[PDB]
Design a protein around this ligand. Structure first.
Ligand code: 97H
Ligand code: ZN
Lengths: 161, 47
């Protein structure tokens, strides 16, 4: 059911997604161990993910949350990095995409900082880095992230280091 | 997966040490996210 539509770099939609990707890079406390050493990206492609069944599953849940929270879905656009990006875009997010050992329990994690999600592209802590060179800071290999529409609803605030 | 805290639909991890970090978020139901954009990229070596 999933089709991928390439956005033109001339499209304002490409440009606004690129700007969120680039402008939310930060330095990480691991000195680049997990995700690599970089201040910016070379964006190679941005594709819209179109799947009507997955979209309807999302909007159905969004209305449920919204109705439980004074008609406020508290919807955000957030980054997600994962080795399972190909399964996610075809079958949707589910329990197999959860970070069992995450700081806030076994759930599906998203970040405002694209560079935070970049640390998870090759696995937890960057795993062993890219398949080809085993380099977590590979500058050659193509990486993929998701920029996702996320319903937060009523969110539990955890202050944390 | 775990459940959301009672009466909540997600968790927000607010950074409390690193002043420059943005928030991270957790959902406990896959149906609460849609993967809108697939971005293909490289990280760039600093000059
Ligand atoms: N184990 C696992 C599998 C797939 C994705 C991730 C992941 N963890 C994060 C933690 C904090 C902020 C963002 C992410 C993320 O994008 N992916 C973690
Ligand atoms: Zn590589």
């Amino acid at each position: 059911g999933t089709i991928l539509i390439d956005l033109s770099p001339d499209d304002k939609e490409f440009q606004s997604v690129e700007e969120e990707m680039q402008s939310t890079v930060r330095e990480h406390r691991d000195g680049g161990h997990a995700g690599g050493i970089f201040n910016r990206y070379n964006i190679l492609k941005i594709q819209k993910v179109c799947n009507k069944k997955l979209w309807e599953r999302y909007t159905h849940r969004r209305k449920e949350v919204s109705e439980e929270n004074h008609n406020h879905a508290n919807e955000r656009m957030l980054f997600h990095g994962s080795p399972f990006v190909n399964a996610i875009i075809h079958k949707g997010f589910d329990e197999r995409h959860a970070y069992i050992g995450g700081m806030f329990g076994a759930g599906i994690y998203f970040a405002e900082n694209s560079s935070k999600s970049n640390q998870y592209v090759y696995g937890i802590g960057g795993g062993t880095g890219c398949p080809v060179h085993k380099d977590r800071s590979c500058y050659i290999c193509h990486r993929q992230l998701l920029f996702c529409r996320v319903t937060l609803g009523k969110s539990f605030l955890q202050f944390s280091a | 997966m775990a459940h959301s805290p009672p009466g909540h639909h997600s968790v927000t991890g607010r950074p409390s040490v690193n002043g420059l970090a943005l928030a991270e978020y957790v959902i406990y139901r896959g149906e609460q996210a849609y993967p809108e954009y697939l971005i293909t990229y490289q990280i760039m070596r600093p000059e």
